[PDB]
RNA sequence: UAUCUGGUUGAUCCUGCCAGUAGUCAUAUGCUUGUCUCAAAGAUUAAGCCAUGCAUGUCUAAGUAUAAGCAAUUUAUACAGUGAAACUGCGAAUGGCUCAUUAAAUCAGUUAUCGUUUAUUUGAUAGUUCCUUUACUACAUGGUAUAACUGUGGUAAUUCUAGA
RNA sequence: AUUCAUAAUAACUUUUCGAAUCGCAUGGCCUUGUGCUGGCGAUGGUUCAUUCAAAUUUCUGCCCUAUCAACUUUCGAUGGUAGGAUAGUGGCCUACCAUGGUUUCAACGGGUAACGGGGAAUAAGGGUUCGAUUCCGGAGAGGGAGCCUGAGAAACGGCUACCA
């Protein structure tokens, strides 16, 4: 207790992260910001293990402090920044822009995405109330307020984000059919065409998820993440499209290339 | 005697313990908020002393050696600008730019003199910044009125789209 | 500070020490293939048990269970690479008898005494442990080595070894060392 | 020595800090210990730039010799180099030198003795030899 | 890897219990000791007591510098190169160590805040305030002290401080 | 699910905030005046949301003892009303009122060579024993108490007092 913690030891990082347990006994400790601690990319992981590009922990502060690493069009020259989902890491130099996006076994992967369409993201609104002076907004997943939404937009929709000025551009409604995302949960990493949710009035609202080989699946209302209607989606989805391939056939799957 | 100091006209002739603080003499703090308990000599003047210390309101007829013949200058001049204005009180409008008080100093066979700065002073540079923050008011607030305009007449139109919807229905 | 490092041990003592049924037999088989201690077997013997304990676990699971098929697939294929169960064996039943010296036999140590160049398991014993072995292209000087059916013929002398060339050897140089100062 | 060749792995442009990341494998027969030092001309005439925007480190030697794998980087120019590789690399290349410091055990000394005086301590250092005189 | 064996009798049917047997991230100790990797380590008794030395300080292009500091000016007669000291701003509530206290207490899984505070991040977000607001008014930006510094001292002594 | 968000009226405030701050680039317009406009930032700032958190809180679960069977309420023990206090709910405290609340389904009391878990040893199966200790939560800085600063401490490489 005594106050708020500075540290992170290791053991004790989100799984994902993929650091190995041994050379070193501190890892990154997210800062503060758009998206939770144990949803968080941060870039010395990304910039250092998946990518790497870099080998220590001195190059990667050389990296941001030159000003090539920008995040959403902001340069966020912070070495544990948080990045979450779909949060667009773009490079000026080297010309790639990168989507985090959850692979299939729920890690994140790296996306490359091109430049046409790596202007915008998808913001899973979280509650719309009215500010003050009577002027309505509405939160996404990664903490954004837009003021002056459409009034159709409710919760727990998904809007498109110009990514340039904070205005939005376009947006889904959370309804059956609709191609959705599961972000947390055991299934983590598919997408699932959604078919039925159950009301639970007084909490933990459920929802019934379809995979494209009509493996269905159930999850909780809070890691569902709409992305688009069935069919073709707003985004680009990395390798495997969220299909939960079993480990059966996972060697069958592998042996097949080697 | 012992060195102890005395706390300005506080009582008793003697020796005591206060809690110093901050804003306060015979203490320096050595932490935000710190307080301390230190010995503290009394007002009173009595033979126990070692040191007293004297200064001299009002000259009388002798000359000192050490005290009125001798005569030190001031260390440093002013550096804002309003207070080298009231050093020479002529106006309001003195440009005091050439007014500094400047201070040879010879490093080696090159002299300069090294007028300081002058704070507070009038820059075409600190002007610019407050146009900038005036305008910068000013621009929000026109995007402002206009947002709300915008929302106003698309929750108009929705309003009316819904009207005439309902206007189809119940024949 | 950092994590634990993860240790096991690999082996486990008879829980009768003297008795001579098992006494002189495990004696025989550090007898003709150069053991030096018990604890050979005794390692053996470790694994041997876990791998019937993993094969007893799976007989018990229903057939077409996938975790039985998927986890048997793995055990019997890795037998398999390593040699210790031959081919026609492959029923996951065969797996739980195959034998205490199989797996011993699969080892560096006999396979040089079985592929020639080494004309007793002593002498071979001594060929591994004094780095004149290439398993593949490099230098192995452990006589546990299990070779995978994927090597055996890959075993040669190191290049950088006599009775492989490259090099006279070391006490044979010195030997003629002596040879070359008499004759002056 | 005998059939050097020097060989480059896994080779990634890392033009974030305008480099070249590759790993430098080595195959000596009859040859050991490889002198990392003369690794950095035959990996510059490879890249054609120069014998000073190269680095190598790592290089453990393999079970028995004739082989080893390290990792190597290479710079565009010796500018960049210069500012980007750590100084302790760059002193082993003869590029920097040895920044004379006292122990770790002096400066903390230092420090220490440094916090007891308030201000720069010259009206301190006449008052105890104006004291010490009497 | 579902196993036992010796010990009451002249010989015996028999939970006895004793003893043997195997393991211990269970310690301690004795004897002995070649190599490679790996690694716990003043917990148990005394959360007993401690010499000494270290273990929290920190600045950029971008808060304040007349060092009576260092170099070059020639971009400058106000300043803008570097920069000790000090004021200021953050930090020092993290980490690390130990397990004394503690038995619906802590803790574990699982809920709520429609019952609250939240420095720091991140997105938004002040046209409205010259007050008897028509002379009260500087709004091309207003007032004071003070540190550092100079000089004069007190003590055996402290990261002690006084006066000008 | 609300006395919710938000808006409206009358007022209130010893009156909060609404930039007298800093670096770089120096560009356009004329009635060419040190005239008017003008970028990239840094720092600061009210409120809202976010994040890092914190506090309180739901349900179930803890070793041994009856040679502990009744306990709690003197002066809080259980509840109600109102108020003070807190950042907040709440006997948390105060005034008044009622006489309640727990208990053989083991209260209350006593012991622990008891911090609790993730886990460790040995186990056919069921189990037994251990967990000071690399991770999570809690407590402590010789024993208590009190408090400044600060968002955050009842902090101890912060302060004050008593005890040793
Ligand atoms: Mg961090
Ligand atoms: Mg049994
Ligand atoms: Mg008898
Ligand atoms: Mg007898
Ligand atoms: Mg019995
Ligand atoms: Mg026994
Ligand atoms: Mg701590
Ligand atoms: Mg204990
Ligand atoms: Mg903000
Ligand atoms: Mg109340
Ligand atoms: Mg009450
Ligand atoms: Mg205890
Ligand atoms: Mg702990
Ligand atoms: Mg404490
Ligand atoms: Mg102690
Ligand atoms: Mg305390
Ligand atoms: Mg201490």
């Known amino acids: 207790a005594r106050g708020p913690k500075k540290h992170l030891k290791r053991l004790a990082a989100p799984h994902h992260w993929l650091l190995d347990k041994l050379s070193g006994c501190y890892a990154p400790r997210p800062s503060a910001g758009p998206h939770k601690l144990r949803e968080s990319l941060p870039l010395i992981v990304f910039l250092r293990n998946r990518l790497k590009y870099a080998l220590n922990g001195r190059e990667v502060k050389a990296i941001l402090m030159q000003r090539h690493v920008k995040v959403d069009g902001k340069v966020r020259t912070d070495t544990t920044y948080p990045a979450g989902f779909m949060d667009v890491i773009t490079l000026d130099a080297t010309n790639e822009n990168f989507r985090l996006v959850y692979d299939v076994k729920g890690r994140f992967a790296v996306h490359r995405i091109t430049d046409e369409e790596a202007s915008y993201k998808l913001g899973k609104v979280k509650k719309v109330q009215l500010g003050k002076k009577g002027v309505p907004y509405v939160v996404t997943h990664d903490g954004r307020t837009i003021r002056y939404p459409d009034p159709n937009i409710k919760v727990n929709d998904t809007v498109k984000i110009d990514l340039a000025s904070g205005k939005i551009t376009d947006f889904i409604k959370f309804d059956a059919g609709k191609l959705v995302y599961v972000t947390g949960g055991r299934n983590l990493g598919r997408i699932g065409t959604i078919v039925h949710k159950e009301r639970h009035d007084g909490g933990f609202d459920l929802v019934h998820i379809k995979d494209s080989l009509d493996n269905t699946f159930v999850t909780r209302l809070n890691n569902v993440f709409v992305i688009g209607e069935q069919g073709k989606p707003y985004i680009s989805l990395p390798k495997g499209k969220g299909i939960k391939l079993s480990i059966a056939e996972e060697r069958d799957r592998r042996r097949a290339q080697q | 005697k012992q060195g102890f100091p005395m706390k300005q006209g506080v009582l008793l002739p003697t020796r005591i313990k206060l809690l110093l603080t901050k804003n306060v003499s015979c203490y320096r703090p050595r932490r935000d908020g710190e307080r301390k308990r230190k010995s503290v000599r009394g007002a009173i003047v009595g033979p126990d002393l070692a040191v007293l210390a004297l200064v001299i309101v009002k000259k009388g007829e002798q000359e000192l050696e050490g005290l009125t013949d001798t005569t030190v200058p001031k260390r440093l001049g002013p550096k804002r600008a309003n207070n080298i204005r009231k050093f020479f009180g002529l106006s309001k409008e003195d440009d005091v730019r050439d007014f500094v008080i400047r201070r040879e100093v010879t490093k080696g066979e090159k002299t300069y003199t090294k007028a300081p700065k002058i704070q507070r002073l009038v820059t075409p540079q600190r002007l610019q910044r407050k146009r900038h923050q005036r305008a910068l008011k000013v621009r929000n607030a026109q995007a402002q009125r206009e947002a709300a305009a915008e929302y106003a007449q698309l929750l108009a139109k929705r309003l009316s789209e819904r009207k005439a919807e309902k206007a189809e229905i119940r024949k | 500070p950092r994590a634990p490092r993860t240790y096991s041990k690999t082996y486990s003592t008879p829980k009768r020490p003297y008795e001579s049924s098992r006494l002189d037999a495990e004696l025989k088989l550090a007898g003709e293939f150069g053991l030096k201690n018990k604890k050979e077997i005794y390692r053996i013997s470790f694994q041997l048990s876990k791998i019937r304990r993993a094969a007893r676990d799976l007989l018990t699971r229903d057939e077409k269970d996938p975790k039985r098929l998927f986890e048997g697939n793995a055990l019997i294929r890795r037998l398999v690479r390593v040699g210790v169960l031959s081919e026609d064996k492959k029923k996951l039943d065969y797996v739980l008898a195959l034998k205490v010296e199989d797996f011993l036999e699969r080892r560096l140590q006999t396979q040089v005494y079985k592929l020639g160049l080494a004309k007793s398991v002593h002498h071979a014993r001594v060929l591994i442990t004094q780095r004149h072995i290439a398993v593949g292209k490099q230098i192995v000087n452990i006589p546990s080595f299990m070779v995978r059916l994927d090597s055996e013929k890959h075993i040669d002398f190191a290049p950088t070894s006599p009775f492989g060339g490259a090099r006279p050897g070391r006490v044979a140089r010195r030997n003629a060392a002596r040879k070359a100062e008499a004759s002056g | ?134």
């Open chain 4, 1 to 134: 020595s005998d059939a050097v060749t020097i060989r480059t792995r896994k080779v990634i442009s890392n033009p974030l800090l305008a480099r070249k990341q590759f790993v430098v494998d080595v195959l000596h027969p009859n040859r050991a210990n490889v002198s990392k030092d003369e690794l950095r001309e035959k990996l510059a005439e490879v890249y054609k730039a120069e014998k000073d925007a190269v680095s190598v480190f790592g290089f453990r030697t393999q079970f028995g010799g004739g082989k080893s794998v390290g990792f190597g980087l290479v710079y565009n120019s010796v500018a960049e180099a210069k500012k980007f590789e750590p100084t302790y690399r760059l002193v082993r290349y003869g590029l920097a030198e040895k920044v004379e410091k006292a122990s770790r055990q002096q400066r903390k000394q230092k420090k220490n003795r440094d916090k007891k005086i308030f201000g720069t301590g010259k009206r301190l250092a006449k008052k105890v030899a104006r004291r010490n005189a009497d």
